[PDB]
A paper describes a structure:
The circadian clock of the cyanobacterium Synechococcus elongatus can be reconstituted in vitro by three proteins, KaiA, KaiB and KaiC. Homo-hexameric KaiC displays kinase, phosphatase and ATPase activities; KaiA enhances KaiC phosphorylation and KaiB antagonizes KaiA. The crystal structure of KaiC from S. elongatus revealed a hexamer in the shape of a double doughnut with approximate dimensions 100×100 Å, whereby the N-terminal CI and C-terminal CII halves of subunits are joined by a 15-amino acid linker. Two phosphorylation sites (P-sites), T432 and S431 that are both located in the CII half were identified in KaiC.
To analyze the phosphorylation patterns of KaiC P-site mutants and to visualize potential conformational variations in the vicinity of bound ATP and residues 432 and 431 at hexamer subunit interfaces, we determined crystal structures of the S. elongatus KaiC single mutants T432A (TSa), S431A (TaT), S431D (TdT), and T426N (nST) and the double mutants T426A/T432A (aSa) and S431A/T432E (Tae). b KaiC mutations xyz or mutants KaiCxyz are sequentially shown in order of sites x = 426, y = 431, and z = 432 where the wild-type residue is in upper case and mutated residues are shown in lower case, i.e. Tsa or KaiCTSa, where the residue at position 426 is T, the residue at position 431 is S, and the residue at position 432 is mutated to A. The structures of the TdT, nST and aSa mutants provide further support for the conclusion that T432 is the principal phosphorylation site because it lies closest to the γ-phosphate. The combined structural data expose subtle changes in the orientations of the H423-I433 loop region harboring phosphorylated residues relative to the γ-phosphate of ATP compared with the structure of wt-KaiC.
Residue numbers in the entry:
A (entry chain F): 14 to 519
B (entry chain A): 372 to 519
C (entry chain A): 224 to 297
D (entry chain B): 446 to 504
The structure:
């Protein structure tokens, strides 16, 4: 590695990437954030991982939270800090005030702390130190200039002692000054900012490394979630473009279609289905997933529009029994309102479910369902995410999209999730003789030849029957074509008179 | 209730933002769905004749059955038309039927089969030699069959 | 925040009625709605036909049209 | 025919039945004189009609 500073890994999923390797050793990192953002957790995970993964004893200095509490809360993620404190790998140095105290003590204690800490580091041979809520101590009665001095002194002794430190700090605004006294920013070697942005009644936590003296790192904010396993970061911009690409075809669940694509979809390929509401994207989705189960391959179906019941009532009415696909442990249906969370959360859930089930085919019925509310870029970031993780996972995928306007839609996606897609399946309503007929079209396929016609298709109990193209028609796409005819009655099987048999015999 | 009907979701969309609305729609739509209740929701599309979209708000995804009414300009006259646009579990009739309104209610008639661009609101009458070919004078090949 | 455990994030609308606080976790509602094949008339037989046998009991029906078309009638 | 003529129409009535025709009307010193419907025109509503002048059934 061509970086000038030595780093230590947090082993926190996603952080080490963003910081190009973890936290610089022998130096100190300010993790500052508003209330409830994940500061303690970060610093706690920082010591835990260092103990569980590298046998590095750790020191935890707490100024407000009680040692029992730090231990009570960490059980949220299944961590037995007590067993570690016991094995003498972790030492919690309690410097919190007393529920019956006085007033005045934040400088010589800053010298008594330094010495207390040095003692603990030396005794437990500690390599990592976390200092939670340094801010709370000057929160006795201090000004910027006093804080800068005391922070520096502390940090400077730590550096000398060799310790790799993490220091927590608070702030009141999500986008204003980095820390309270607008002084901590500049004294630290590194600065990580944790945010919890409100925006339209939802909450979005992000993690940003503002500075790392010595090496580079990923710039800007990064979405993340706190789960039962601690912080979990998605470096959506560290996602490279080196997905493997095969010439392997697979079926779509529809014979005629597969022909239309010049022999089925590519295994390694993102599929896009768009048409007006009611055209039938959801049918191809059902058909796509059932065929993965008809070949004894797993497949997930994330539904964001239909309940788990309906999906089955409708699916059955088209033939295909979803009840069985579920029992044979071959098809897994998810289901969720896009509103039940934020993209970050949703993208993870998807990622998760993809691991606990090793699919070979995934279908997201209605990207445009997830499109609800979210800004366009926040949506595209998601589409890059799902479309990306899948491409590098060899997982074939079918994505659905509902164009806000039946007939007359001048564009594939109102979102432009076009260039992100390899194959595009376009459905639409054609107005012929006072009636609404369907029309399916393989708009684009990158490695294949695919059929160029805009066929007509019927939906029966059997499923999708792909007929022929409205040759003798112009302005097709318009929604309401004009019937021009150089023929129609031309051969095909004229021979008038009695051509049929009726129910009796033939 | 076994059935519920809110005449004009579009009347509740007044003022309120769009996401606040979509949140309302998700609300009384699912609550009805789990309670087993059947509900009919009304929507007046902001523009007569030319409506390129079911709902201006785009709730045509949280719905199961879409019924569509629309004026059709016919010979200097404003006639109605009805079309079951989409039905998730059934087969439903694909015809854009015309219909009158009397004391008796709504008499659904036929489809305008000899027109073009009906969804627009200003169709284009186009029989001009219907389904009978230019051979309405049947050429004359039929001049041998009947004799003396 | 809730040091120690999980919790739904963000805002959630609530009303204060004659029965205290009433919160609606519109984001908590799950997609587990029961769905059958049972039909139900509309009050319009011709319609019921076009819908291949009436509206399903378990279903949401939306009527859209220009002013004066007749949604309030259906 | 290169002329700005009017047309009145009862678009909707919640109670009664009202007329469904788009009627041409003139204005004079006597007031509104509602004439007839452009029965033989297309896209009236649009505002720039197109007389069909259909050649009947052409015999
Ligand atoms: N098991 C868990 N699953 C999901 N979220 C959790 C879990 N445990 C805790 N959390 C979340 O993490 C947060 C805990 O924050 P944390 O204790 O790490 O420090 P903080 O919020 O940065 O600072 P402060 O000490 O001011 O609260 C809670 O607000 C909560 O939402
Ligand atoms: N059993 C059936 N028999 C005949 N036609 C059916 C049957 N089930 C569904 N259909 C037809 O298929 C359509 C259902 O649409 P589908 O579930 O395929 O998804 P979509 O149109 O892409 O999206 P959305 O359902 O959200 O509008 C109906 O509008 C209807 O015309
Ligand atoms: N007794 C009647 N006879 C004939 N036509 C009637 C009668 N009553 C109402 N109508 C017609 O039906 C229409 C009434 O519309 P309706 O009350 O059904 O609701 P809407 O069109 O959905 O919504 P809104 O009334 O707000 O415009 C009138 O515009 C009119 O043309
Ligand atoms: Mg659907
Ligand atoms: Mg009304």
């Amino acid at each position: 590695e061509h970086q000038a500073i030595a780093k230590m890994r947090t082993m926190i999923e996603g952080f080490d990437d963003i910081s190009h390797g973890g936290l610089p050793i022998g130096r100190s990192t300010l993790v500052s954030g508003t209330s409830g953002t994940g500061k303690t957790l970060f610093s706690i995970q920082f010591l835990y991982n260092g103990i569980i993964e590298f046998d590095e004893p750790g020191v935890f200095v707490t100024f407000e939270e009680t040692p029992q509490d730090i231990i009570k809360n960490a059980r949220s993620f299944g961590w037995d800090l007590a067993k570690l404190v016991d094995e003498g790998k972790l030492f919690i140095l309690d410097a919190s005030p007393d529920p019956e105290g006085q007033e005045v003590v934040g400088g010589f204690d800053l010298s008594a702390l330094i010495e207390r800490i040095n003692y603990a580091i030396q005794k437990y041979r500690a390599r990592r130190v976390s200092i939670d809520s340094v801010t709370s101590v000057f929160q006795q009665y201090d000004a910027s200039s006093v804080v800068r001095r005391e922070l520096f002194r502390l940090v400077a002794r730590l550096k000398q002692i060799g310790a790799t430190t993490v220091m927590t700090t608070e702030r009141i605004e999500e986008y204003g000054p980095i820390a309270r006294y607008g002084v901590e920013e500049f004294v630290s070697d590194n600065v990580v900012i944790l945010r919890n942005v409100l925006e339209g009644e939802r909450r979005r936590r992000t993690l940003e490394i503002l500075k790392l003296r010595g090496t580079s790192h990923m710039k800007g904010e990064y979405p993340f979630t706190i789960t039962d396993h601690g912080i979990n970061i998605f470096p959506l911009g560290a996602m490279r473009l080196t997905q493997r690409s095969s010439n392997v075809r697979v079926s779509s669940g529809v014979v005629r279609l597969d022909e239309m694509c010049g022999g089925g979809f590519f295994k390694d390929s993102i599929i896009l289905a768009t048409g007006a509401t009611g055209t039938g994207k959801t049918l191809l989705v059902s058909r796509f997933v059932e065929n993965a189960c008809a070949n004894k391959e797993r497949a997930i179906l994330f539904a964001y529009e239909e309940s788990r019941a309906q999906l089955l009532r409708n699916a059955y009415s088209w033939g295909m029994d979803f009840e069985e696909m579920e029992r044979q442990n071959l098809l897994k249906i998810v289901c969720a309102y896009p509103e039940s969370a934020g993209l970050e959360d949703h993208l993870q859930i998807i990622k998760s479910e993809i691991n606990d089930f090793k699919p070979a085919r995934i279908a997201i019925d209605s990207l445009s369902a997830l499109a609800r509310g979210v800004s366009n870029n926040a949506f595209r970031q998601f589409v890059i995410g799902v479309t990306g993780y899948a491409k590098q996972e060899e997982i074939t995928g079918l994505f659905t999209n509902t164009s806000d306007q039946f007939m007359g839609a001048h564009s594939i996606a109102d979102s432009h999730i076009s260039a992100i897609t390899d194959t595009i399946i376009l459905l639409q309503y054609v107005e012929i003789r006072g009636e609404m007929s369907r029309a399916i079209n393989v708009f684009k396929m990158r490695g294949s030849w695919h059929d160029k016609a805009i066929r007509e298709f019927m939906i029966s109990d059997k499923g999708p029957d792909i007929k022929d193209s409205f040759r003798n028609f112009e302005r097709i796409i318009s929604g309401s074509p004009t019937r021009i005819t150089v023929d129609e009655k031309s051969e095909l099987s004229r021979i008038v008179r009695g051509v049929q048999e009726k129910g009796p015999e033939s």
